[PDB]
């Protein structure tokens, strides 16, 4: 149909899944020279760490992180993840994940974390979904490569294990997202085909997203 990133996943659904399941473990050299959560909130107008431009300048309640996109990279296709932890443990969770989030090997060029001092405690992005990781197709024609999907899945699974290994308590996953039982913190939604309001109907549609299935099955 019109071709698009998702059309490609649908038509190469099994090829991608099979290629991914044959690849060797991904390795991410974690960064050490990174800010802690307090440092992140001090980003203000502008800060830099491992190539990620940081800012906590205002408008919204988040601290943003963005590394320059490769010329070979495609256009955002809606795929993204949230990370939900106990509200009280966001600073510790951030620190635990910093080495991966700022990694020169990370597949995620853009992400954001809630500034807990800018939101009310009972807020949707306060009780959970305190991190948002944006994914985009890695190939010039806006298609996902098997290599990149495997790397992304490996990365999200590393985030999961790091938080669990740190014994971080889980948060309240947003109604908008879906996640399998083995993801205790991560959740997913595609912003091109879903909104922020929950509903089993939207979760149902999301569960059928080829990208989500490739990330979980």
């Amino acid at each position: 149909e019109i071709p698009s990133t998702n059309k490609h996943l649908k038509n190469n659904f099994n090829s991608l899944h099979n290629q991914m399941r044959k690849m060797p473990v991904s390795h991410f050299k974690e960064a050490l020279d990174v800010p802690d959560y307090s440092g992140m909130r001090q980003s203000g107008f502008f800060a830099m760490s491992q190539g990620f431009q940081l800012n906590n300048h205002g408008y919204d309640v988040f601290i943003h992180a963005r590394r320059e996109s490769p010329q070979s990279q495609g256009k955002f296709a809606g795929d993204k993840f949230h990370i939900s932890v106990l509200r009280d443990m966001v600073p510790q969770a951030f620190q635990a994940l910093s080495g991966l989030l700022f990694s020169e090997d990370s597949p995620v060029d853009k992400w954001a974390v809630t500034d807990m001092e800018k939101v009310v405690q009972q807020a949707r992005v306060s009780l959970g979904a305190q991190f948002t990781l944006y994914i985009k197709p890695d190939q010039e024609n806006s298609q996902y490569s098997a290599s990149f999907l495997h790397k992304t899945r490996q990365f999200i699974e590393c985030l999961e294990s790091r938080l669990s290994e740190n014994g971080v308590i889980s948060g309240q996953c947003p109604e908008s997202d879906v996640h399998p039982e083995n993801w205790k913190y991560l959740s997913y939604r595609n912003e091109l085909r879903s909104g922020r309001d929950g509903g089993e109907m939207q979760r149902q549609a999301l569960r059928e997203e080829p990208f989500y299935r490739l990330m979980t099955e």
Binding site: Y59, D60, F76, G78, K110, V125, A129, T132, E191, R196
Partner: peptide
């Protein structure tokens, strides 16, 4: 102000 959107 609390929107997790990409833009």
């Amino acid at each position: 102000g609390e929107a997790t959107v990409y833009a």
